[PDB]
């Protein structure tokens, strides 16, 4: 067709979406005022024309994963991992990113498995914890600590599974990527509704918790598939806001409408903290470009 | 443009691809004659015009995952899981699929984590083994056995991590989805090169192994992203074979060419079992439609 490539959403139902901040499926849509909180995730960040931001990368299984080599042993239950990029290349701290792509963007004791394969194909794997709140969590400097309950200088991967416990768990608190005394850099910006009566719309997952009491909520601004889609398409954004409507393809009915902002987040006309139920066959549909002053029908 | 949607590949480097048969990144390209083996994976199967086959579904984190409820305990280290679909809907055994979508398609002791969340948000998770070779591995009948080292009638998920050990491990041996005495049904067909001098080209990952000696090779016919891409695009296939060339975008050089078949697999002109090294910035490029008798340049 003529002119600029048209903007599109992938056609995916809620059961066909992945969380972009933790490697699990989306469970539900959620809206909240998030009173008192700065919402600034670094994974799951992209503009509508496909510019990845923060620590966002494309591979779902690399989300919250770490890769590298163990150079030493701390505390015999702790190991020093010299981080590389999730794709194998060494990590250059001078790169204009907050941390290696896919690095966890929240404070937690992350339950996972540390595994190695030696050149002679002898292997080991042990479950353990990655403490992203720890003073020794310094991925931007090129190292983190892995805990276990391992061979030195062998190819190593940490596969995240969930939360070990609820201690230190704050999904909206960023890690100190270079350690506690150092500023984070090259961050994706914080996000907020800019129009009165509006709240953020999240794609929510409830991640596994080894022990304790929590809904384990991880909220992402965009599902991983949307990010992958925008990256491929790279469709220009004529205005700052795309108008999207959640549509039931069978009936043709529109359940609600939302603002998809150019910087990569969604707002809806709603109030309070609540899950938003959608039909299993329904999906978001891009209808037209509008501006920041468009007035959404209340949900 | 005019006429039928044009066929395209997503532009993704090898470091930007996911395995469609196990939830891990692609490590390398691999080719092999696979002498003596029937190559019939059920995950990672799609036609070029986006028809998913076998047990293939879209969500990467649902690959080799299971979901359901535990109604009883066998052997107190064994639990009976009544499987649902990975998206939470109940599984109907009369559906025209070999098993619930995302069910593992190979024989192994799969190391993973079983987790639950109760309505009061009290949670537990324990690592364990899913034995896909077991007589009690009957997902098509609606049940499997989960091993641990758990609450009854609570929402349960098995998150795969890797191989517990190398026993029974055969990546090309399909499970008996309804148990040992029953035929598998609705299978994606076996695949083979149909032109002399040609071999299958695989997207290979080396998955974690808790203990033992193995390269842990899992070979998929198409990366998960290609499957997701074809599903969205649904571009018609004018002929049975698409001609693709691995191209270095910087230089413009073509390293090698391959046949991308309509049924969703790749062949190359090569011999023997060997890894195929590609430049980090390179990617497959669709150049034109050809037929089954096209003669590929030797690699």
Residue numbers in the entry:
A (entry chain B), B (entry chain A): 221 to 294, 297 to 371, 376 to 525
From the study:
The norovirus genome contains three open reading frames (ORF1 to 3), where ORF1 encodes the nonstructural proteins, ORF2 encodes the capsid protein (VP1), and ORF3 encodes a minor structural protein (VP2). The S domain forms a scaffold surrounding the viral RNA, whereas the P domain contains the determinants of strain diversity and recognition of attachment factors. There is considerable antigenic drift among human noroviruses, and new genetic variants evolve every other year, which can result in new epidemics worldwide. To elucidate the constraints on non-HBGA binders from a structural perspective, we determined the X-ray crystal structures of the capsid-protruding domains (P domains) of two GII.1 (HV and noro485) nonbinders and one GII.2 (SMV) HBGA nonbinder.
Moreover, Harrington et al. observed that HV did not bind HBGAs in saliva or synthetic HBGAs, except for synthetic H type 1, which bound in a dose-dependent manner. HV, noro485, and SMV P domains diffracted to 1.86, 1.50, and 1.60 Å resolutions, respectively. In the HV and SMV P domains, we found two loop regions with disordered residues in the P2 subdomain, i.e., no discernible electron density, which suggested a certain degree of flexibility in these loops. In the HV P domain, Pro295 to Asp296 and Glu372 to Asp375 were disordered, while in the SMV P domain, residues Gln295 to Asp298 and Trp378 to Asp381 were disordered. The equivalent residues in the HV P domain were Cys345, Arg346, Asp375, and Gly438; in noro485, they were Cys345, Arg346, Asp375, and Gly438; and in SMV, they were Asn352, Arg353, Asp382, and Gly445. These data suggest that loop B might influence the stability of loop A, since loop B was missing from HV and partially missing from SMV.
